[PDB]
Amino acid sequence: SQIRQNYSTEVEAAVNRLVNLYLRASYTYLSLGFYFDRDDVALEGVCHFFRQLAQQKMQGAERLLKMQNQRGGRALFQDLQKPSQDEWGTTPDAMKAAIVLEKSLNQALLDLHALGSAQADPHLCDFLESHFLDEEVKLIKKMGDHLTNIQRLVGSQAGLGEYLFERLTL
């Protein structure tokens, strides 16, 4: 490559893997969202919450891909596994799944940051710090807040609490 500079093959490959993780996440969120749009689930605010996350994760993938090209790496795509479930249970079940999923993304970001630090790649580290790490922390805090709220509600009365959360928070 005529532009590549200080960009290890290890980081290049890890970036491609992270793209696959972000796209898998996006896919998982599309499934979550449309589950809550089922007529026998019917929680619009929950559907919208997950559809917005699907979009966000796709935008994350796109940012990674743009950076891969900026650095002179080569994007390589792999098969995308389907989401882990076909049906996602109640709102708390779904919110717990989402936090698991985000923590896995976040750990993948931390791992890539560590690789970048080992490879002495400050551009990578800046990119991740600026566009991903705080966004993940903020998102996970929001999900934890949601989970606490939903649990407090459905602990009182499950159906009623699920409705109220969807109406008054989402």
Next chain:
Amino acid sequence: SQIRQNYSTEVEAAVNRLVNLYLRASYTYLSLGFYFDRDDVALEGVCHFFRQLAQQKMQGAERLLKMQNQRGGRALFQDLQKPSQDEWGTTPDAMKAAIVLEKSLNQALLDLHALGSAQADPHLCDFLESHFLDEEVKLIKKMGDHLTNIQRLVGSQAGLGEYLFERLTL
């Protein structure tokens, strides 16, 4: 002092003590507020309510300090004790703590007013009446109204009631 007139040493000292009480109150409210921002508490409206009070109590301190200088007194600061608790329980527990705290401020204002009256210091009495005493009465009435509402709600169903109060009142 070239400006001091009719300003007793007793009032000067009591004003400094009251500043310490207002700053301690402010500190207590900062703690309350950030407690309700914990991911395992997660009541945004409660956090905002207490953060706003922290600001209000700081503004009270500042007004006292401005008056101390206007009268030719000398501000003296003391150590500020930490708030009485590290964790503040449920919304009713916190609202009860806040009313205790405000009643203590109010009693300190009444005591200073009484001292001013004994010292024949009408400027002090006017200052307190105009900027503090009605504000405290209004605030305590609001807190009592909140407490009644929260108690009525959590008496019905604790988790659900706490959510609804935070969503629909705060």
Next chain:
Amino acid sequence: SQIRQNYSTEVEAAVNRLVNLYLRASYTYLSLGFYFDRDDVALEGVCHFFRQLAQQKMQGAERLLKMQNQRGGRALFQDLQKPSQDEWGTTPDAMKAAIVLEKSLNQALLDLHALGSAQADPHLCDFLESHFLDEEVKLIKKMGDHLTNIQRLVGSQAGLGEYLFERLTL
């Protein structure tokens, strides 16, 4: 904690300590400011300069507290010691005290950054770099510039120079 991830107990505690330092700084600035509002000191621009810093340091504390909760740490408050002086001398004395104080904050930030780096906590490092470290460098440069200006003025004629600095710089 349901959200905490890669957030050491060492960093959690150091963040709480830093909050105490920022609040102590805020308190020191409140004292500085109201000193310069005394009728026998009477330098409005100096009072405003320090009152604005008091606000800034409080905002720093608040940002730290928000981050502590975002990461799933638990804010813990300690007693706040009173400022180091009751009276703050002339403008150069006060500006020197402020630079001492800011350098101590800055060293505490650098120490926390070093701890974060040792704990492999890139989110912490980004947070500090983005919201604190440059702000401190900029502030210290401004204070140094002020001190040089005040010293040059009061070296010529003390009273006159102090007035002119307050009128024409602040």
Next chain:
Amino acid sequence: SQIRQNYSTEVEAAVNRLVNLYLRASYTYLSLGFYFDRDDVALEGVCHFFRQLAQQKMQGAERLLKMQNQRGGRALFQDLQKPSQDEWGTTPDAMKAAIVLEKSLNQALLDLHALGSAQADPHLCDFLESHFLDEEVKLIKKMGDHLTNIQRLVGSQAGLGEYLFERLTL
């Protein structure tokens, strides 16, 4: 009187005396102001400062007179003594004279407040507290601040300091 109620003859007379004091003050300020407009004094900002005070003291007299009629008292005017000096010296001399004068007004207000309190006349006490006592405290604090500034300046270099104060403060 068809409207007079709870308005003692003692307060009525003291109000008339206070009017004479406010008008005497106004007269003193007119003299101060025009002194600083002399071609051999020539401090415009000082002239404006005192001319504005002359207006303020006249407005005070007018407010007292309006209140005297509101209560069913009868305004009685006495001769107005000329100001204590024909020439008023330097800016610090003049500012010291003004603070003496304001402290005398303030003591007269406090004395009338005390009389009102002894006569159980809450309307009088409210009137004084609301329209006079804080205004006097604020004014005296401003004068003290000015005096400190002027003294610091003329202690450095008298002529130069007097000019700078007039240009940059007034």
